[PDB]
Amino acid sequence: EGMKFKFHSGEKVLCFEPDPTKARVLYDAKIVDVIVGKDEKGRKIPEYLIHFNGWNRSWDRWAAEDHVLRDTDENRRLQRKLARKAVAR
Secondary structure (H helix, E strand, C coil): CCCCCCCCCCCEEEEECCCCCCCCCEEEEEEEEEEEEECCCCCEEEEEEEEECCCCHHHCEEEEHHHEEECCHHHHHHHHHHHHHHCCC
């Protein structure tokens, strides 16, 4: 690998809505795999296979490190804020 990974396989996490057509929110999620990938420019980055809790494995997707947050009180609070803001009615 060479590089440093902030998260690890098996780690329960909060992952942002990966669909840009959808409201920004944080899902309860789990790291399922980790590789070295690339950004828009071809520069090496870390990437994570995310399974989203309560969603079947067809929703699994690769995310960049910054789209994933550690599951903490602090990020739980943010999850609440983002979720209640997304209610459109």
